[PDB]
Design a protein around this ligand. Structure first.
Ligand SMILES: O=S(=O)(O)CCCSc1nc2ccccc2s1
Lengths: 250, 250
């Protein structure tokens, strides 16, 4: 029925410096919103400590940009347990960049999401087709296969901590945002699939966010679509306009 | 010639928590090392901040366990520039776990090392052959090709900030503890290659660290080997025992 609580998530990706983030964080702290909205900021692992120490806005949660399922002999990686111990309860998993550059198959992503949910994390699970896949008319087949791989490892209860982020690969950092119709069409497909497998309530309460060239200028029109519950913001999240994007979820 | 300054590096891998690392750090801080030695601790990115704010032992430098060549749209990753801005001047690259689980090829490792050196970092370059490769009699071909790949991208002057770590992946991967003799067998060929391809000066100043199983029990015997200049320690580097391992390089 009515839309669940919206989410405005910032993916700073592999960017940042203390001198840059300090002022940015202060802007976030001074920002107020008159509607219920879950704001999220995902710094690089290296910047999580300074962010957690400085960010005070209660409507904000800190998320890691990735994580592996187990602590151990995995040089260079950061596990969910390590993040949990540090007080981080949100995490982005399966980002297109990780599926494409760092060998994250649908199954690997699913294992990550499964362990994250079991660990009590709110997970922003990313899905999305490439330009070639959309041109070949494989969009639905692709995103449903990505989502299905994850769902198969989750229990019914786990969905209360699951968030889906649809980011068409052709819309990431290209300045070519999906039209409201294009986004709505996929969000519908995703939610309808979830409903067929998990029921009315879970499908209705599920937040499905759009990501890919989202800006303060195109955010409002996108958010008004019936099946869009917020955004995963890349480039514009490291700018002051990110506050306007949040306001766009009112 | 005499051995150059030894290095005792701790690779904490994907392990750590405030409760574990604080006591260990203060234990390292309390220890006093009378000889010339470069100590290194490589915490996960998440723990680098607490380590930098707490580590005081004068013999220590803090290193990252990995890094990518550039900042940008690489969700989950940390770039060399972000680390440098944070004040981290040491980095481990090409560790077997990344070459095996995260598809880091010789070219990828070589490129990372080249940009690292260009960025002014001291780099611990990891090389090593698997059990299969060793059983096929390919130890030399494998490790030297890995080393050659990185060597081709560097200039002679860069080696002053390069460090090689030999990982007997064949031993680690089979749950075995390589003997000082098996360790030295590879260090001998590694230095022979460096001596003939890069120069007598480079070979004499180059630290070639043993990255196999090192504990307070076998550290001294390993360091006694002619071509071993220290270690890249695993599990034991997370224990107070690491103090004795460092002392074994005297
Ligand atoms: O060479 S293989 O690909 O068969 C094994 C590589 C070791 S990676 C892994 N190590 C552990 C250890 C405990 C639990 C789960 C895992 S996955």
């Amino acid at each position: 029925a009515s839309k669940p609580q919206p989410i405005a998530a910032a993916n700073w990706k592999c960017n940042g410096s203390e001198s840059l983030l300090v002022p940015l964080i202060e802007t976030l702290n001074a920002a107020t919103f008159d509607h219920d909205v879950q704001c999220v900021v995902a710094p690089t692992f290296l910047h999580i400590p300074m962010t957690k120490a400085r960010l005070t806005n209660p409507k904000f949660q800190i998320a890691a940009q990735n994580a592996i399922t187990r602590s151990g002999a995995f040089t260079g990686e950061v596990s969910l347990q390590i993040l949990k111990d540090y007080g981080i309860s949100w995490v982005v998993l399966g980002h297109s960049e990780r599926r494409l550059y760092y060998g994250e198959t649908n199954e690997i992503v699913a294992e990550k999401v499964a362990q994250a949910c079991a660990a009590g994390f709110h997970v922003i699970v990313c899905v999305g087709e490439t330009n070639e896949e959309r041109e070949a008319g494989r969009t639905a087949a692709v995103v449903l296969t990505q989502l299905a791989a994850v769902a198969q490892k989750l229990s019914k209860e786990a969905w209360s901590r699951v968030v889906i982020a649809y980011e068409p690969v052709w819309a990431i950092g290209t300045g070519k945002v999906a039209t409201p119709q294009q986004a709505q069409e996929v969000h519908e497909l995703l939610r309808r699939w979830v409903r067929s497998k998990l029921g009315t309530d879970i499908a209705a309460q599920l937040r499905i966010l759009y990501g890919g060239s989202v800006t303060a200028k195109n955010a409002r029109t996108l958010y008004q679509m019936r099946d869009i519950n917020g955004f995963l913001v890349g480039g514009a999240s490291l700018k002051p306009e990110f506050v306007e994007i949040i306001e766009a979820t009112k």
